[PDB]
Amino acid sequence: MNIYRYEENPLITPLDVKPIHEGFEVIGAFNGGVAEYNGEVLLLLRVAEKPVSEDPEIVLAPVYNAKNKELELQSFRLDDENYDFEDPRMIRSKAKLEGFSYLTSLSYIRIARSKDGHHFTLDEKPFLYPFNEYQTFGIEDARVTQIGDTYHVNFSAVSEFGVADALVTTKDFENLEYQGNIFAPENKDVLIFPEKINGKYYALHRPSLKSIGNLDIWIASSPDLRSFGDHRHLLGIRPGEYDSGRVGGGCVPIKTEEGWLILYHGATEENRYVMGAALLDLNDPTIVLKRTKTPILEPVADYEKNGFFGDVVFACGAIQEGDTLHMYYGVADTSMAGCDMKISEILHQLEVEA
Amino acid sequence: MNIYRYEENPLITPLDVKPIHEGFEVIGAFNGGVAEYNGEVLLLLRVAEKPVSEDPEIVLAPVYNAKNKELELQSFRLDDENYDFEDPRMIRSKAKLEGFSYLTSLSYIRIARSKDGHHFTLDEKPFLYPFNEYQTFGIEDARVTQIGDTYHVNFSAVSEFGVADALVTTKDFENLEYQGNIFAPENKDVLIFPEKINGKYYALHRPSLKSIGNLDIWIASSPDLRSFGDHRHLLGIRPGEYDSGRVGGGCVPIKTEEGWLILYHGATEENRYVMGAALLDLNDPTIVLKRTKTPILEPVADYEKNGFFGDVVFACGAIQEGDTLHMYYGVADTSMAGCDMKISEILHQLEVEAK
Numbered sequence A: 001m002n003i004y005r006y007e008e009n010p011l012i013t014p015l016d017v018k019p020i021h022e023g024f025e026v027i028g029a030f031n032g033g034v035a036e037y038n039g040e041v042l043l044l045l046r047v048a049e050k051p052v053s054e055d056p057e058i059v060l061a062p063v064y065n066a067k068n069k070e071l072e073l074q075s076f077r078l079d080d081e082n083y084d085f086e087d088p089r090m091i092r093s094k095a096k097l098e099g100f101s102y103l104t105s106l107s108y109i110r111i112a113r114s115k116d117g118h119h120f121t122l123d124e125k126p127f128l129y130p131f132n133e134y135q136t137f138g139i140e141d142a143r144v145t146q147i148g149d150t151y152h153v154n155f156s157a158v159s160e161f162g163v164a165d166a167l168v169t170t171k172d173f174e175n176l177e178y179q180g181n182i183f184a185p186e187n188k189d190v191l192i193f194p195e196k197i198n199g200k201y202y203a204l205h206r207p208s209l210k211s212i213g214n215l216d217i218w219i220a221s222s223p224d225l226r227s228f229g230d231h232r233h234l235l236g237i238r239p240g241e242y243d244s245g246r247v248g249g250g251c252v253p254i255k256t257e258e259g260w261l262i263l264y265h266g267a268t269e270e271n272r273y274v275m276g277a278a279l280l281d282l283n284d285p286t287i288v289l290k291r292t293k294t295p296i297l298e299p300v301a302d303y304e305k306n307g308f309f310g311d312v313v314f315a316c317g318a319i320q321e322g323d324t325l326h327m328y329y330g331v332a333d334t335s336m337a338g339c340d341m342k343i344s345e346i347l348h349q350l351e352v353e354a
Numbered sequence B: 001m002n003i004y005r006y007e008e009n010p011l012i013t014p015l016d017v018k019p020i021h022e023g024f025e026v027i028g029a030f031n032g033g034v035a036e037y038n039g040e041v042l043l044l045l046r047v048a049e050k051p052v053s054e055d056p057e058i059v060l061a062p063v064y065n066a067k068n069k070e071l072e073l074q075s076f077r078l079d080d081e082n083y084d085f086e087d088p089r090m091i092r093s094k095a096k097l098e099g100f101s102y103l104t105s106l107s108y109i110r111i112a113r114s115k116d117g118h119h120f121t122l123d124e125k126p127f128l129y130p131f132n133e134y135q136t137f138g139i140e141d142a143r144v145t146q147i148g149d150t151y152h153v154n155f156s157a158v159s160e161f162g163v164a165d166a167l168v169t170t171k172d173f174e175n176l177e178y179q180g181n182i183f184a185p186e187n188k189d190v191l192i193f194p195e196k197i198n199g200k201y202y203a204l205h206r207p208s209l210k211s212i213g214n215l216d217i218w219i220a221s222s223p224d225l226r227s228f229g230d231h232r233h234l235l236g237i238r239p240g241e242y243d244s245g246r247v248g249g250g251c252v253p254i255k256t257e258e259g260w261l262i263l264y265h266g267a268t269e270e271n272r273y274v275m276g277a278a279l280l281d282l283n284d285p286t287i288v289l290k291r292t293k294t295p296i297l298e299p300v301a302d303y304e305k306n307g308f309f310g311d312v313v314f315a316c317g318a319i320q321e322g323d324t325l326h327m328y329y330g331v332a333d334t335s336m337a338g339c340d341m342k343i344s345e346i347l348h349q350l351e352v353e354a355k
């Protein structure tokens, strides 16, 4: 397909960002939400900070304590026979390898801005930093849906209570209004549709299920983008294919003449993440018209294959300029990259492959 | 608590209920939702039916096929080295004992009615039977919240896509309006508060969490009892206590002068189920004022301790008559029982144990 990976990729790396917690290192600046505001591209960067131990036998988990409003650190020995450290993102109980006890880093959101879409400058301070008991392990993966003058900023809120999805609204990225957890745990990859559709708002979501059910995309409707209901299954995993392990929403749904174009991430059970596409009915987006059989973006550049958690491209938003999509994506849970694609070429791939 | 357990207990057993599927046994009539309608007590019974296998080395999963609207049984060998059959409620994968692949039975809802609250007669036909792709393993544990003339009947909808919670509304238990899955999987034990509270509806719910988090009661608000949000954690598990393994909503919240009285279930990791109480703020039910340290109802009688899944009391509804609560409860995932208690005595126990 025409994939124009920007010459400047990776656009923003951990080298570009100073840690805000003393004696932490920045291990990632990634999975950035995408907005246009006041003539600039805003990336709402996920910045992950890991606390450094000088003893290599020990690792630390950073926990934001909501009751005293400070960082506490939990220590573990790597030889602790009750825990598994083989996944660099998490500290897991050997008896519960399907989950985690702690993360290895703590994330917050920080805005970078660009005039040209290629060269970015960080805002001075964080944008959103854990501020309640649903956020003690961090705030991650902010998505931005702009409806009129209102930006809907929604993000994973991770804590000992579960992984929930929460919403902040703003008109200027300065005065923020907190709207609570719009999806109960366990959920993430929530993408609000950019219009009211035959009298209702909609959002993509992604329940994670303990007992039965795969890691599949769902959809829900809403009268007001505060409360959500009429939950339906939308897109399921496909055994043996690029999305055999999980699927989740990526970019905000894109209105086309052919339907709502859904650029979603898929991963195998080995955790190689790629982007795919789906097409939903314009008037009832609970109906799937088409889906790709092969990816539209794979981790093939070196910054995509190698880093903190290699073989990942993870797109959390894009700017439409006519037929061109300026798509920004996390690479290897480490950095941010940019590429241009064409909506017509993705719609073409959908037609051919379905 | 001075519990008066009804003389007729168990009120309704599997022996009282004939199977609607050819060649199945009724294994439970239990976890009944509770309403008053037209001068009678309604129990919205969960009836569970297990297919009988002619071959004792095979167990059958009874699955409803949504496209063909009939059962399509699935067969599994007891010696199949992939599967674990130790929990009689489910067929589980050995690599996923925290979950299940199938249930051993399929449930639906059937109404039983009573003039006196003690002797029940069954309606002729099922009330709610799996009718869509979200209900292929059954409809379970229907709760009923009456607001004005409208009955909110909400239940677990179990399928391959997960355990969701779905809502049907009605004014007469005859004309039904499906309102969708009101809570996304994985969720159950949803209880809708019986009035609007400072301009919002509320419901208790209970997310099950794959990665992190315990089996804790949450609450959510709603403008219309179709969409919910503002999700908040409400009651957590307590190590070493009767609710150390999980909690969930039981009866509909009861308006009292001291708050919303929540009669909830708690279980230990050994799966002994009791009823507890909590008390929430009357004006903002997201605030917990008190909670019991010991149960209000535990399995003690023989019909509570012994059956298909023993040592369970599981109340899904209650009728208030002044200070008297007429509580109906599943016992041993087998039958329905009745007891009377005093609200004042529950309040008092909350006061004493909170300190």
Ligand SMILES: OC[C@H]1O[C@@H](O[C@@H]2[C@H](O[C@H]3[C@@H](O)[C@H](O)[C@@H](CO)O[C@@H]3O)O[C@H](CO)[C@@H](O)[C@@H]2O)[C@@H](O)[C@@H](O)[C@@H]1O
Residues within 6 Å of the ligand: A031, A089, A099, A103, A140, A141, A156, A158, A163, A188, A215, A246, A267, A271, A309, A312, A314, A330, A333, B211
């Ligand atoms: O690292 C790859 C992307 O994974 C997700 O986030 C991370 C982590 O993921 C859990 C599940 O959400 C996934 O299906 C699977 C990932 O391969 O396993 C993990 O257990 O969740 C934590 C908590 O939210 C997070 O810190 C990790 O980054 C994506 O949501 C994305 O954030 C990552 O790029």
Ligand SMILES: OC[C@H]1O[C@@H](O[C@@H]2[C@H](O[C@H]3[C@@H](O)[C@H](O)[C@@H](CO)O[C@@H]3O)O[C@H](CO)[C@@H](O)[C@@H]2O)[C@@H](O)[C@@H](O)[C@@H]1O
Residues within 6 Å of the ligand: A211, B031, B089, B098, B099, B103, B140, B141, B156, B158, B163, B188, B215, B246, B267, B271, B309, B312, B314, B330, B333
């Ligand atoms: O049998 C006891 C009660 O258990 C729950 O329902 C059964 C089963 O519950 C599952 C999880 O929901 C629980 O935390 C735990 C039970 O001890 O483990 C189980 O995996 O769920 C299935 C599917 O919904 C259901 O058929 C079983 O009845 C309870 O909601 C309740 O219905 C039972 O009385």
